[PDB]
Amino acid sequence: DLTGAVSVVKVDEIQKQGENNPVKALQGRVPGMNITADGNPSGSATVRIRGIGTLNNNDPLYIIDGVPTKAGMHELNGNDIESIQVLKDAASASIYGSRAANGVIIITTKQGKKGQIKINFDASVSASMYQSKMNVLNTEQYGRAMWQAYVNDGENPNGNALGYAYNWGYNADGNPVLYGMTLSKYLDSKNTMPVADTDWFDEITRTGVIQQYNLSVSNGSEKGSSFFSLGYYKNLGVIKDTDFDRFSARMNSDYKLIDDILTIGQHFTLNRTSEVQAPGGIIETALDIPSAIPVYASDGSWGGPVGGWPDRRNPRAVLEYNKDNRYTYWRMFGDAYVNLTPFKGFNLRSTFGLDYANKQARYFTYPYQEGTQTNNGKSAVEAKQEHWTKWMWNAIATYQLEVGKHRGDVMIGMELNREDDSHFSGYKEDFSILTPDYMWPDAGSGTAQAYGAGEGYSLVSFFGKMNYSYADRYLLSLTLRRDGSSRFGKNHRYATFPSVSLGWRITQENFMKELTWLDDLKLRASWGQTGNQEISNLARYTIYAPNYGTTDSFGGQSYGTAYDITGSNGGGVLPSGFKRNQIGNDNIKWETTTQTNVGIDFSLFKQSLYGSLEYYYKKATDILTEMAGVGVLGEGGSRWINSGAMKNQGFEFNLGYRNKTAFGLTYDLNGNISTYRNEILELPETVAANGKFGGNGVKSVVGHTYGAQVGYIADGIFKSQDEVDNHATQEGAAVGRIRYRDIDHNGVIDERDQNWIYDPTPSFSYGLNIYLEYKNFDLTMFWQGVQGVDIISDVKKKSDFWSASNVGFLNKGTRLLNAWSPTNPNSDIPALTRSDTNNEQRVSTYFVENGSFLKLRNIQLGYTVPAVISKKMRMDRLRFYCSAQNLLTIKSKNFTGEDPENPNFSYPIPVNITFGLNIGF
């Protein structure tokens, strides 16, 4: 669309990040499009376009070669993409589908230009290194902090029933001082577990290796065209025993018959990926386990806590036991189309899309036994299978005309969609040989379970779109859809979504021609609506499930319907029944997102200064909300209601300067910046008290930002008994403890003294791509910043306290070595205690930090061997290069951790340093 808000991505920049997932290589490149990703080797990522659209699903929609799919991108071969445009407003998005409410991304893959036969072999290798690693007490440091904690509370530090003994006394002033410290050699009496100074993060990390190869080949005839690529990725993540890889093939082709009036074409890609994923919570386990626990126990078993040591698993052993939990994923994606043009301007076209993946995996349960961390002797295997089969069908009629100065596209069409999913798995316990070779369900001698279910939905869509241009200077555009979904009853099946966009090519009107210095200026405005139906396939219904209770729980609460009504104690099948999962709602309808947008493109000084501004107001109404039930309603009282509304408004700015220089240096900058506000407008009563989208179940998020949080205000530290007795009554308050603010001024510090203390929305984010060519060399940098963001740190709970955790004696951050005491009175860090008397675990400003950052996302330096040398080996282009991703991080002095982009326990974001090449005949 020339009338909508459309960010057009320079695809040649993408391949310079060596990223597997291309979407991950747009991180920061598009204003309005926030792309988030941890460091896991898939390169899987999360996209949010223009704030937070709705209260169910905010993921965008891809149209790859005219086929809609809502998820993957790291599952396909990023390397055979030709073009990517991101459609941000509703006028441009809507015509592409009924799932457009969160923006849409149009991807077209490479074809073959006519009369041309090229080939392209790109290849690359990288080392991947853990960078921002968290500083964590060592065995000696552990013993110092412990003595401090004991002593502050005034207990005998020799009473730590771990291995420590302390030689300590009192200085002249009377405060306690530690002189020397001895450690036992074994953590248990029976000497099965030696004392270590293990650095656990070093132990579970490794130098990753990335590989990448891609071949592509194309051919162009007057009568047709054809394309063929093969690709491979492989990435051993920096966390040990985690890896990812992908094999890719793509064939596209088209055929022009009769008189280029019957046209047949096909796009198709085939992919096989496979991965072993990092377990849930290894980073936290690595943070948690004390240095004193050795990797290996006396006998060569895995090391583990014993005696008084905390209830924490051995993180190396976890990763090793999970190394064969590999899934294998085959996805087939493509379409075939026919195009008829029965006379000038008239086109009929019909496309059938197919999107089909299947995922296989055995997940193994080996028996573990790290000290007191035991599993009994359980061994099991689960063979799991899943299929996702989506197909799409549409027919399209379009007319074009050009009357002197009038222009005009019309198009009406129809589209059908259908997904059908199935999944099932067989589970078996008890194996004699504990290897993946033996551990198949046929070979278990214990109990079995079988699992699985299906589901699906269908969509129907009728649409038309009308473009008009007057004299190539005034443009009007009109979109209109009627959209039905199987997820609603007949009485609300369909919904109708119009869109209107206007465009005013200012400069082509004569009274601007008196300006040599501005080549185009175009003001555009748009209004339009998009439906949203992205909800549970079962959303309409009252759901009873048999749920006999065959399934792993945690600490009980399986909520099963089986019961030994007879009192036999079991041994055989019990009688069972049904339990409510969900209350239905006869009158769920389409949720509606309405967007108004205005913006201006511009080009100055002979195409050298270009860019565009964007302003939008984006509102979601009748929002489809999974709404909790009132408490007394009980089991499965939730229901999907249209009940809720949310705004997003903001500005988006692209600006690129390009020009060469008279000593041989081309330089091309294009940066971008954007900002937005998000507000929840209305919300069901029970979701407001819920906290589900906001204020912690103490205040209602209505009127604040999605995910805003409420808490106590920490006002420094009581530094003198004076300051406690003069403060409001605060349970557990003493010298060295956090002073919490008395917000209501009632003279008591209690649950009423909390306030809006957290907002996830930045003041603004921005990106910037510097490019230089000089003497066959080239240099790229990409910088990305987010400015003004609050983060909530849960590491700070582990770094700044001895007892802000559920369990005593865990490993702690290295900052608490600086904790306030009489000894050391120049500190923000609360004094070490052994009991959270003051409940400094309560949500509070203490954990909100400034998570602003600027990151050198990428820097690449290339040499391309000059033509005359290379052409003589028959190579249009030969280029070597070398690059590094996420090389450098600038952050706030007030951020106390390592990665402000990944402040807690997600898969660390490594620094990559890469070498590679480009050959093309």
């Binding site: 007191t372 009994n376 499930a545 909520y559 089986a562 079991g570 019990l574 049904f578 009991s835």
Partner: protein, 555 residues
């Protein structure tokens, strides 16, 4: 256009209309039992032990005061917030059990009795369950919502209130449920998980026994002891009703807490935990999964207090040391003791659930607190480590039944209401207390040789049948309830029936600070801490229809 968007339909479920069919009526009934086994978790056991840490019987246990911080707050009466996750949790879970009762009743109401002859016994079963939950919510929160309209639409739940009824008539609406159950249940249940008519009587009685100590004022103090209510406790613990169902005290105390002896004469109604039964790891008592000692790796919750330990001490004639018991620790060599101590509290140097091969010590290997919470283990819910009944899922749990009403409870509840109705039947209530006390004195099977191997001096004797004063008789029943029901999570609930909570527990806080240092800053605030606050999120969603309990600020 039309046929296309209807083809795919919900897979693997029964839909709302379908569920009402008669073919599913007994499915719903079973499902309403199941949730008492499958609806609690390690912090919400429908035994309510996690909340009897408030009592003088026990400490919360665990790693330390943060291991379930909200329950330490409960244990010391300080820093309880109405926004606390456990308080919400248990409120929510108990009303979930109520759902399954009412859904079954909604189905059962429409059934034709000519063609479903047990229609009213099933209906009674469900109404028994519904009273079970309401009863426990009433103990927990005082000001509860009464949800007993099984044909009530979802939306009508939004306009309910926890003050629709006065406190007394809240109690009566519970009594109504257990009454209908009495009128309708059969005398005997061949399927032992189903309550028999005596169970309905016993719970009926228990409901009037809690109703009779009235709090009709605006706070929680006693406003007089009603004797129409007390006279019901008599009616419905009549030994003639109990014999029609065959209930009575086991010939040895330990049987109520042993896998081999499930569903005995004393087990009036129990939760039927089971193993090897088609479920992932079994319908085990996961709710007690925290209270296994360190011998199993985790987690050392629910540890008894030295207070309770010393309570089993007896004078030289085998009677409780009413005034002196807590002034010196129980000492094996030189003190006379009640056999029930060794069925309730596993103590250092002594066997863990009657197994000479597991002797408890003040060790890493038994307690987790480095001494903070002591070195005692809760015996009633744990089992022999060798037991067939014991499995580890995510926690260690067994298939040992949780008994909601022991027949000892029925005798001591009769004893109580008689003593409170000063009406000449006190020498009967004494003779009830001696039924339990004499049974207990002889419960030395499985610990018969503790005299010669460890030195214990068992000495317990019944009270002489005199014409006791009512004040002195009360303290003899109370003392029997101390030793008989120790660690069974009704001790603190007893004190709030008696209006004695602040006195006895604030006192406990000072006597026990010496042994468990957590009670240092503990303080019970009367007309406040006798009941958990109604959950904040619950009030806040009600839009002013719910009312908070007395003593708590307008939040």
């Amino acid at each position: 256009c039309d046929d296309f968007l209807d083809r795919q339909v919900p897979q693997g479920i029964v839909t709302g209309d379908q569920i009402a069919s008669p073919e599913y009526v007994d499915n719903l009934v079973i499902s309403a039992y199941a949730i008492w086994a499958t609806g609690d978790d390690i912090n919400s056991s429908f035994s309510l032990w996690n909340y009897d840490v408030r009592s003088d019987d026990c400490y919360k246990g665990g790693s330390g005061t943060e291991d379930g911080g909200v329950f330490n707050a409960l244990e010391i009466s300080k820093g309880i917030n109405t926004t606390d996750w456990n308080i919400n949790d248990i409120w929510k879970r108990l009303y979930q059990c109520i759902t399954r009762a009412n859904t079954a009743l909604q189905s059962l109401d429409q059934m034709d009795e000519k063609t479903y002859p047990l229609k009213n016994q099933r209906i009674a079963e469900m109404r028994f369950l519904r009273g079970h939950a309401h009863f426990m919510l009433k103990q927990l929160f005082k000001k509860i919502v009464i949800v007993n309209d099984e044909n009530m639409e979802p939306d009508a739940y939004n306009e309910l209130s926890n003050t629709t009824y006065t406190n007394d008539e809240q109690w009566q609406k519970i009594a109504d449920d257990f009454q209908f159950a009495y009128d309708n249940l059969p005398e005997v249940q061949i399927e032992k998980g189903r309550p028999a008519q005596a169970a309905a009587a016993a719970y009926l009685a228990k409901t009037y026994l809690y109703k009779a100590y009235r709090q009709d004022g605006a706070d929680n103090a006693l406003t007089g002891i009603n004797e129409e209510d007390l006279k019901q406790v008599v009616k419905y613990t009549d030994p003639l009703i109990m014999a029609k169902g065959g209930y009575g005290l086991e010939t040895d105390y330990s049987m109520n807490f042993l896998p081999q002896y499930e569903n005995g004469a004393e087990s009036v109604w129990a939760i039927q935990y089971s193993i090897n039964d088609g479920t992932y790891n079994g319908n085990l008592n996961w709710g007690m999964g925290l209270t296994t000692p360190q011998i199993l790796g985790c987690c050392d919750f629910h540890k008894p207090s030295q207070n309770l330990v010393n309570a089993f001490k007896t004078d030289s004639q085998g009677k409780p040391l009413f005034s002196t018991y807590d002034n010196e620790n129980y000492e094996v060599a030189t003190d006379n003791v009640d056999p029930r101590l060794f069925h309730t509290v596993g103590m250092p140097g002594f066997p863990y659930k009657y197994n000479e091969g597991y002797i408890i010590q003040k060790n890493d290997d038994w307690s987790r607190s480095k001494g903070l919470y002591g070195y005692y283990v809760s015996l009633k819910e744990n089992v022999d480590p060798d037991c067939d009944c014991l499995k580890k899922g995510s926690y260690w749990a067994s298939s040992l039944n949780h008994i909601v009403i022991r027949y000892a409870d029925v005798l001591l509840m009769r004893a109580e209401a008689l003593i409170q109705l000063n009406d000449g039947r006190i020498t009967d209530a004494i003779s009830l207390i001696n039924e339990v006390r004499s049974r207990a004195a002889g419960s030395t099977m499985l610990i018969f040789n503790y005299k010669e191997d460890y030195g214990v001096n068992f000495k317990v004797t019944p009270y002489d049948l005199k014409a006791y004063a009512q004040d002195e008789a009360m303290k003899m029943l109370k003392w029997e309830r101390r030793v008989e029901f120790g660690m069974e999570s009704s001790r603190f609930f007893d004190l709030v029936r008696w209006g004695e909570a602040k006195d006895v527990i604030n006192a406990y806080y000072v006597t026990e600070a010496s042994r468990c240092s957590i009670y240092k800053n503990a303080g019970f605030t009367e007309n406040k801490n006798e009941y958990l606050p109604v959950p904040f999120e619950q009030i806040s969603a009600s839009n002013g229809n719910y009312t908070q309990n007395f003593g708590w600020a307008a939040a």
